[model samples]
Target: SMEQVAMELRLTELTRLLRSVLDQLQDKDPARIFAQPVSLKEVPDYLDHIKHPMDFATMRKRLEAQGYKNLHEFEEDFDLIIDNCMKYNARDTVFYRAAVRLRDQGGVVLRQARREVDSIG
Candidate 1:
């Protein structure tokens, strides 16, 4: 159960980062970047299907540890995914790849981190 808890945390972080990226996409002019000019208004539901993995900072650290030439390549890839998603109103296999990577990296970290909730319990 300890490992399962860690996996959930990583997945939650992945969800947050993707949501942030989606929100950023909204600030740009769809007319300029999108072929279909769709809205991110419906993206939350779309995000429901994605699994959590890691955040931008965590991902950077992992790539650096893996001897990547430069971590910025991830940023570039993220931007490309955002652009493509905006243009076609869809995401690709990036999220799946992220999950696999995170799972391979021992599922998740056990430390407590900040989290925000949508409701008061």
Candidate 2:
């Protein structure tokens, strides 16, 4: 029993170490790169007939459902948003400050946009 538990713990640690190395080597900053924060004002009603090209109505709803009452709640909201948006379990703590700042612009639109992306579990 002790041996099995020890092995599992070691594996977890190794995984963390490996991921850290990979993250540093590759530019995977979701908040700053992949998952860009959007706004309601930017979304176009029709994909083909729109210029701004953002469905903020949907984005805002998504943000609201996740307990983001307002822009002031960026801290938790960004973290949750990134967590939900990530495909491979990307963590926000590695870049939390930047994530909050990057999300500032999107916060305004989040309040008005309708819920769209179903946040991951």
Candidate 3:
């Protein structure tokens, strides 16, 4: 069916866009702080502070698993990754600064994706 084909194509495009966003964010993380989940052993109070933890690796896994229904779902996780960092790490710390940088860069990448999606539809 043409309609079914169109829907599949849209989903494929969305997946590609979301993956690209994740790649960009991961690339910006030079310290690799956000690359994986915050180790409880490393930060003993991580769970006590952060109720929800998010990371690039987990996001990638979810993306590959097709757990996201749309870009908004993907964006939420992306934001969570940065927000969690900012929440746990103090403003003067490297981790917090990196989170701020990622937040700004992520906004740019997301806007670009929005433009691309508009052009497609």
Kindly list the per-residue Cα lDDT of model 3 for residues 13-115, writing each as its tens digit: 7888778878887888888878999988888888889999999989999988767878778889989998898888899999999999988877888898778
- Number of backbone clashes in candidate 1: 1
CA RMSD for every model?
16.0, 17.3, 1.7
Query: lDDT per prediction?
Result: 0.38, 0.38, 0.86
Clashes of each: 1, 10, 0
Ranked by lDDT, the better of candidates 2 and 3 is 3
Give candidate 1 regions above 4 Å deviation.
35-77, 81-121
Tens digit of lDDT per residue, candidate 1, span 1-121?
Answer: 9998976665555555444443343333223332232233856454453333223344444443542322244344434434434433333554334333332331122111112222210
Mind giving the per-residue lDDT tens digits that candidate 2 earns over 1-121?
Answer: 9998976665554444333322332233443343343433663333343233222233344443443333344334344544433322235554444444445644444443223111210
What's the ranking of the predictions by TM-score, best on top? Answer: 3, 1, 2
The candidates, ranked best first by lDDT, are 3, 2, 1
Name model 2 segments beyond 4 Å from true. Answer: 28-121
Candidate 3: clashing pairs of residues? none
For candidate 2, the 10 contiguous residues with the lowest summed lDDT are 112-121
